[PDB]
Amino acid sequence: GYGNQGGGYGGGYDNYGGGNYGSGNYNVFGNYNQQPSNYGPMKSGNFGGSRNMG
Amino acid sequence: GYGNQGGGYGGGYDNYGGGNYGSGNYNVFGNYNQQPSNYGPMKSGNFGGSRNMG
Amino acid sequence: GYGNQGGGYGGGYDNYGGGNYGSGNYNVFGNYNQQPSNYGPMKSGNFGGSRNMG
Amino acid sequence: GYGNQGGGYGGGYDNYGGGNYGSGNYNVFGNYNQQPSNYGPMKSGNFGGSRNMG
Amino acid sequence: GYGNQGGGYGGGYDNYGGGNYGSGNYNVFGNYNQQPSNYGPMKSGNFGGSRNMG
Amino acid sequence: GYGNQGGGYGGGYDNYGGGNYGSGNYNVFGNYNQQPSNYGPMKSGNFGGSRNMG
Amino acid sequence: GYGNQGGGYGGGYDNYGGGNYGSGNYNVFGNYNQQPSNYGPMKSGNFGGSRNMG
Amino acid sequence: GYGNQGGGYGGGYDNYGGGNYGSGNYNVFGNYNQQPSNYGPMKSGNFGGSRNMG
Amino acid sequence: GYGNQGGGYGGGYDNYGGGNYGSGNYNVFGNYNQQPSNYGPMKSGNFGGSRNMG
Amino acid sequence: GYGNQGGGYGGGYDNYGGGNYGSGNYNVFGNYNQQPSNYGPMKSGNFGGSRNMG
Q: Residue E38 to residues C27, C32, E35, E41, I27: CA-CA distances in angstroms?
């Protein structure tokens, strides 16, 4: 792994979004159980005209 | 793995979106169980006219 | 792992969003249990015209 | 791990957001239990036109 | 681990947000128990046009 | 409607089971909704050698 | 409506089970909602060798 | 409506079980809501060798 | 409505179980709300060899 | 409404169980609210060999 050299803008190894959302659970249930899960909107990156050049 | 050299804009190894959404679960259920899951909208990247050049 | 060299903007290894959201749980339930979970909107990155150049 | 060299802006290994949100729990329940969890909006990064250049 | 060298702005290894929010709990319950948890909005980073250049 | 007259056992207008199980709902949903329903075993009547004569 | 007259056992208008289980709901939802419902076992009547004669 | 006249046992208009279990709700939800409901076992009537004759 | 006349046992208009369990609610929610409800076992009637004759 | 006349046991209009359990609520919520409710076991009637005859 070696980073960027150069560029008109700043080259970066930017991690915007990632990870585990409701993963790797170990559930052992008996009879009448309830387990709901809501994961809201994910916005990862550049929004609203960001990282713009003049 | 070697990064970008150059460019008019900044070359980068940008990770915008990724990961595990409701994966790798181990579920053992008995009889009358309920397990709902909602994953909201995923927006990964550049939006709203971002990373634009003048 | 080696960082960026140079760029018109500041090249960085910026981690904006990540992690575990409701992951790796060990749940052992009996009969009539309830376990809801809400994860609100995730905004990771640059918003509102940020990191702009003049 | 080696940091950035240079850039038009300050290259940094900035960690904006991360961590464990409701992860790694060990729950053993009997009969009629209730365990809700709400995680509010997550804003990680640069907002409101921040880190801008003149 | 080696810090940044230089930049137009101050390169730093700034940790804005992180940690464990409701993680690693060991819960053993019997019959009719209740355990709700609310985690408010998380704002980590630069807001309100901060870290701007003249 | 007139009840029974007589019998070796007691004649009765016994209602053992009945009613509405998940009926007459008015549901108006938008986009990504979830609504599961489990109705457990129904036992209506005489069980375990009941209402027996000597 | 007139009750029973007579019998070897007591004639009765016994209502053992009935009613509305999750009926007549008016639900108006938007986007990502979750509404599970579990109704446990229903036992209505005479069990365990009850109402027996000698 | 007229009650029973007579019988070897006591004729009665016994109501053992009934009513509304999670019925007639008016729910107006927006976006990411959760509403689980568990109704435990219903036992209505005569159990364990009750109302027996010698 | 007229009560029982007579019987070997006491004829009665005994109401053992009834009523509204989580019914007739008016819920107006916005965004990320949680409302669980557990109703325990219902035992209505005669149990354990009750109302027996010698 | 007229009560019982006679019987081997005492005829009565005994109300053992009834009422409203979590009914008729008016809830107006905003954003991230939590409202759990547990209703324990209901035992209404005659238990443990009660109202027996010699």
A: 20, 23, 10, 10, 20
Taking the CA atoms of chain H, what radius of gyration do you get in angstroms? 20
DSSP for chain D, written as a single string: ------BSSB----B-S--EES-S-EEE--SS-B--EEE--EEEEE-SS-S---
Query: Shortest Cα distance from B10 to chain C (angstroms)?
Result: 7
Number of Cβ pairs < 8 A linking chain A and chain G: 9
Would you call I19 and H19 a contact, using CB atoms and an 8 Å cutoff?
Answer: yes
What is the CB neighbour count within 10 angstroms for residue B20? 16
Method used to solve the structure: cryo-EM
Distance CA B46, CA B50 (A): 6
Whether B12 and B4 have beta carbons less than 8 Å apart is answered as yes
Residues in F closer than 8 angstroms to B32, CB to CB, are: 38, 40
- Residues in chain D closer than 8 A to A20 (CB atoms): 23
How crowded is residue F35: how many other Cβ atoms within 10 Å of its Cβ? 17
Contact I17 H21 (CB under 8 A): no
Percent helix / strand / coil, chain A, rounded to 5: 0, 30, 70
Q: Show the tokens assigned to G14.
A: 């016994």
Query: What is each CA distance from B4 to A4, D4, F26, in whole angstroms?
Result: 5, 14, 58
Q: Identify from E35, E46, E51, E52 which residue to disrupt to test chain D contact, counting D C-beta atoms within 10 A and taking the largest count.
A: E46
